[PDB]
């Protein structure tokens, strides 16, 4: 069996429906179609933006990374995440 | 007059590269527009100036020189819905 992460589960979709070389060709075609798709209109639907300089020169100097739409955050058990939050 | 829409904003703010998120459409927060989106508003106003006959020159050897913004002290900036 096989699956895929939060992007790549459209390769493991295609994967699963691959039989010859050109049908598999042919599902990576809809694949990348698709994910065209998503590229598109999840920036249409937020943007990224600028952002204050401040900001990110604090962030970068605190070791953080880059200010992005998602964080990751380690060595914190779920309970106490949803927490602070 | 004329209608500052939210498309003419989107249009103008990707023509100049603008990234400032108060310019972007965001849920909870009213839609604001570049302060020198008048220029846009204002140009077929301001540019029948230098077409009266008393200036009368080459007007192909045109330069534009210099230009100055300047809010009126207590002025809203522009919103999306203004009939401006």
């Given at each position: 069996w096989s699956t895929?992460?939060?992007q790549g589960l459209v390769t493991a979709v295609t994967i699963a429906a691959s039989d010859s070389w050109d049908s598999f060709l042919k599902n990576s075609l809809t694949a990348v179609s698709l994910l065209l798709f998503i590229g598109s209109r999840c920036l249409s639907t937020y943007p990224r933006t600028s952002l204050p300089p401040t900001m990110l020169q604090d962030s970068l100097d605190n070791g953080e990374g880059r200010p992005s739409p998602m964080l990751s955050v380690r060595d914190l058990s779920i309970k106490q995440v949803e927490k602070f939050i | 007059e004329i209608t500052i829409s939210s498309q003419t904003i989107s249009e103008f703010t990707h023509a100049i590269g603008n990234k400032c998120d108060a310019f972007?459409?965001?849920?909870?927060?009213?839609?604001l527009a570049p302060m020198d989106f008048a220029i846009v508003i204002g140009w077929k106003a301001?540019?029948?100036?230098?077409?009266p006959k008393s200036v009368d020159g080459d007007l192909?050897?045109?330069v534009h020189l210099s230009n100055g913004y300047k809010m009126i002290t207590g002025a809203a900036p522009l919103k999306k819905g203004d009939v401006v």
């Open positions: 895929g992460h939060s | 972007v459409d965001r849920p909870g927060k009213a839609t301001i540019i029948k100036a230098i077409f192909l050897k045109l």
